[PDB]
Symmetry: D2
Subunit: 405 residues, 4 copies
């Protein structure tokens, strides 16, 4: 950011240049190949650089989905015999990736209670290659002490990876709080409209591969690449290795059309996030005062166990996804869904449309109470993802539905 | 809007249904035909209904461009021998349409000073079929008294057409202040990112064709449509006639791809417009106080000749396009452009990126001072279209550029 | 075409160049504007040039639809008080355009029996600005003597316009047989898959505007174009005027997305048309010999009134759209449709999927018998559009359906 | 294929249904989620079913790229400690995948000479989970005895996987000749125009998982899917497991937009492949008679050792990619490229445009001659990918270039 632009200017402009035609919008390079006079796609290139700029990182790379970005970030530093230490409050898709697919390939993940950063240090051994957390947990809506976990990682010479999907770089930039790599499911807030899948890896460029000694593939001349040393790429070491290795081999590439649509959502990102957050604050204030609401999980509430972490790390708010339970338990939460007119029942989050789900009667309908709890779910649990509709319309819809339960 | 929803809910939801797949986003029906078991495209149909709902109209129809939407609106009610009374401050593209293309076809337009609504009535005769104005003039940034012009039209049994491109329905809804038809170049604020062309016509549904008697094509059964009387369609009479006649015959149809991108922009429309407006207020306040600014045309300024109209009709602000002139006149305006690094030099408006133009040295570089004046431009005139970048960055760009002129 | 490339090379390469990125595919320039340093979109520009090259023309211009292309081609040379002489066997949409929309605007069209070229001559007067035909008429599937009609137009110093939608430039190039302008509904064969609307105008560059004297708007310097004389643009005179005038004013622009899809179809154009034709020859042969078929209109049949025109102008065949009647009349035609499993019932032509329609029981169902024959339709008439499925499969579908009729 | 359609009918129709709107083309479901009343995309679903039908398989699944399709097919049946026996004449990208990314994850691949099928049996042990070949090798253009290799695989209770990218289902259907799984880079011929990446996996439904014993993950109830036994899904077992496991976890999903473009290329697939082949036959015949051509690898040549495999398995030809060497060696090859006007210099294959590359002076320019020989490349080797331009134009281009060499 040589120009010292603010967030809103970067989300509209960063990474974008004007080609020979003068086209003011980024052209969609729906091409597979380039005539020899490029390894990367000129549309996706803008996404790489823009998301990196917004996270105050040094370089980025974009993939088909959040899952593919997380997969590539782990495979970039971990192989058979290596280990990861991860928060045990992970999104279900990431937990399945860690506990099934990657485990089958010789990578062991230890899951720890992230409420105490020392739980990470306990699980580190000579095989650990990264610590892994999410900025805002799902479905616990729990926060973590980025700086304390990053210090533990760095004292042991290993990198700290944060999935910032729920936060977006507008609410928190984990690279400035101890993380070395940030990943996103751009499918959520970055795209903004429930249309387009994508994933992004951003590196921060402040991790000394050579001082660490635990990443020899970064410090050793790779004859596959004419003796290139990835650590000599500085702030592009991690993402160039992804590009040159895991992405080259396994091909979870994003379509240029999808990149185009992510660029459009990036140009309005903070405007939408601000309204997501203000809508959520109003909705949470209404629900917390409602006599039929038994509990709410939103870390910005003064009595939340995560309130101090919210004050420290989330000065613009803690996003627009939260959970709650009604005094009528599982039956009331089921009945609430049925009477809502504006909230859509589905399993996704971070649409411009408000969404709601009662996992115990839908996505987790096969599980008993103990199995539900193992997945961080209770029979009364309801998750809400607040959209950018008019907040008074959303509150009236919740108000009338609560009157039915 | 039976449930009585606010603007922001409508921009996210209006016109959109969930089909048999449950898909939460509107599919892109890139199809030319439909198996006989519909007449309209299901993607574009959402645009039709959403923009109509936002203008508090009864029905809408979408076309390839604002130019096409304006052309179809006029041809819907005017043929050889008919007349139109329009403001003489019209956008140049619309002026060329009226004074060249439609004049060749036997439609005569009278251009009157819109500052006094009585000038419209002076030009009305027995062949007049509509009055036509823009919500906010280009490049005069001039306002007009909607309700006074509408009463003149309706006292003479003719409809009032308003191009609301520069306002959007978030800043003014002309159908609530005497207009019968609103047209948009959706290319501008509705799309929001300078990627996608489209035009929209919305009707208000409160014009009595039969009582007027001046539109026999709306009141007479047509054997082409098997005895249909367009006036019997009530709030869909005007747009159905466009669909059934001018659009069917002349084919300025929008791509379903473009409609999909317009829907995306609609879902963030008020969020963007609000930021356009707050950015513009800040920039205008900074320019009003700058020693090298000689004048500024922005109707919200208390000393503007249009300030009363702004307070009457524009309670949320008067948009993000304005003009100014510098103390160094033509040469200073010519020099300012070369020194700006964030604003983009081009002839468009209403992008997410901030734009500027000094017409006398670019688009109008070939005209002498008299020819310039005939086009609404002076040698010193600069036009700015404010984007949604951070306002401090934009003000800093202007400040460092003004320092060099 | 300086290096004298053949049709198949041009459909893959013509108009396409490699930009600074080396992208081998044409990027999609989904942009509304260009930094001032442009009305021509770089994606659509390739369509312009490629279709013009395939028709052996000098310049092209692309619009939203075939209807828009036809409208602009007529408005480009005809205004109020002017006249057109057209075949009375026109596509229905074109008939409606000429007889309703353009008539309302002072352009009079006389419809003459095109079977006799002198019928065009006898309708010419001092107001006539063009002769207009289609290469293959619909629903009659009738051919016309291009060179005879073209000589007539030129002896009177007016242009000859041919709608070559049904032919494509692969089967006939009317600009080589007396036409001055060719228009296409690119929606049909050029796109090839029933997904994408567009229209194209191609000029031949062999008409002497000055020697004619009947087109002063082409030869007088125009002050709103800095004294430009359109005739001085040579083989780009007609399409530049459309671009600078009718298209500029009325805005029937094509989306860059649609242009990109038309380029894809063009790259397979002759391969698909060849198979359309061979499939149709096989199917017509089967139906002509079938005891339940009463008559078939396909001009390549030796007993057709049009066979001589087919041999002269259509050495590669006469397309894939034909009509037929069954011995069981209307009832048998409608039962045929009911029993078919592979043909799709709809009103379109030139999909990759085979299509069929019985107009008297659908698109013309509320019309008596004098009604229909005025529209070239009889109660028994069936129209088939042959796709590129396997010919044996289509014949087996026809055979099993006919067995039940 | 319940009604026994031929290839050309399937490539137009298979997998496609008409929804409630009647839309004749497949809508683009650019959506991330679906309201609960899955997440299989309805656009991509048509690709899955169409490619499976064309390969005469029972089920398919589509991924972001061919690389991702191959990755998922291997991970579907191999984990840490497992082994693959592949031909040593692999596409370079696939060699890198097996030899780098997968080897790091505990999957060992043995590479054997595929000219002798016994070489596959030699390398089989109790860790082997599949045999892997390409239908037409690169860059040797070598063929393999599908039935012989398939018998070895099944004698050992393991599956046989064939990458049919170079063949397409039009030229050979390995599932009918002993293969159990066919993968495609749909980026190449299926897309057809160098615009759109994709990969597809098709299973044949004939492999008895329970009888084999070597795939316990297919026969054991999976608690992650409520006791599902994947083998119980019959001819959907392999691809459902990919969908539910590897693709779920690692997320190399295809964009609905890319699926839409693949559908369009499928509707013309056999038409393009036929022209690719006939062009290549003409070009190879010309090159083989040319005095400056020292050697040509094309399996259909009468002196090719692969001629009998071409006759047995490729009745419609052996594709449009081949290699040759010139009498002037490396310097002559380099010069040929510089003088060609129609062939595009780049590293890809199977565009509609003809493509050419001389690896020794471009992609592998940094390798010495014995590094070259490791990759099956000689200093004189040229690879040509023949497009669908006019064959005489292409022959003329080759002739004038050779004359300067
Ligand atoms: O403003 C927005 O958020 C949308 C995103 C896609 C195009 N415009
Ligand atoms: O026919 C074809 O090959 C192309 C593929 C994309 C659209 N049409």
């Amino acid at each position: 950011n040589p120009e010292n632009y603010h967030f809103e200017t970067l989300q509209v402009h960063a990474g974008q240049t004007v080609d020979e035609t003068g086209a003011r919008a980024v052209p969609i390079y729906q091409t597979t190949s380039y005539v020899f006079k490029r390894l990367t796609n000129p549309t996706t290139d803008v996404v790489d650089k823009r998301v990196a700029a917004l996270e105050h990182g040094t370089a980025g790379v974009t993939l088909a989905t959040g899952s593919a970005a997380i997969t590539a970030a782990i495979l970039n530093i971990a192989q058979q015999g290596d280990e990861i230490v991860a928060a045990n409050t992970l999104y279900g898709g990431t937990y399945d990736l860690f506990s099934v697919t990657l485990k089958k390939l010789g990578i062991t993940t230890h899951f720890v209670d992230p409420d105490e950063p020392a739980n990470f240090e306990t699980a580190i051994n000579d095989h650990t290659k990264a610590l892994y957390v999410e900025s805002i947990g799902n479905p616990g809506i729990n926060l973590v002490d980025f700086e304390a976990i990053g210090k533990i990682a760095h004292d042991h010479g290993i990198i700290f990876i944060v999935d910032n999907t729920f936060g977006t770089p507008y609410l928190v930039r984990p690279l400035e709080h101890g993380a070395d790599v940030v990943v996103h499911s751009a499918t959520k807030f970055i795209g903004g409209h429930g249309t387009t899948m994508g994933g992004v890896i951003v590196e921060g460029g402040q991790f000394d591969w050579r001082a660490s000694g635990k990443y020899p593939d970064f410090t050793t001349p790779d004859p596959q690449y004419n003796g290139l040393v990835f650590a000599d790429l500085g702030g592009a070491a991690f993402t160039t290795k992804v590009r040159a290795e895991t992405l080259r081999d396994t091909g979870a590439t994003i379509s240029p059309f999808n990149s185009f649509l992510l660029l459009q959502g990036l140009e309005s990102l903070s405007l939408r996030v601000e309204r997501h957050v203000t809508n959520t604050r109003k909705i949470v204030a209404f629900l917390k005062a409602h006599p039929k609401v038994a509990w709410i999980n939103y870390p910005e509430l003064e009595d939340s166990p995560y309130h101090d972490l919210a004050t420290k790390y989330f000065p613009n708010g803690v996003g627009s996804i939260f959970t709650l339970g009604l005094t009528g338990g599982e039956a009331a939460g089921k009945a609430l869904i049925e009477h809502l007119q504006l909230f859509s029942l589905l399993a996704n989050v971070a649409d411009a449309k408000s969404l709601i789900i009662h996992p115990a009667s839908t996505t987790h309908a096969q599980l008993n109470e103990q199995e539900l709890l193992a997945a961080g779910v209770t029979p009364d649990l309801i998750r809400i993802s607040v959209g950018v509709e008019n907040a008074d319309d959303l509150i009236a819809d919740l108000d009338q539905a609560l009157a039915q339960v």
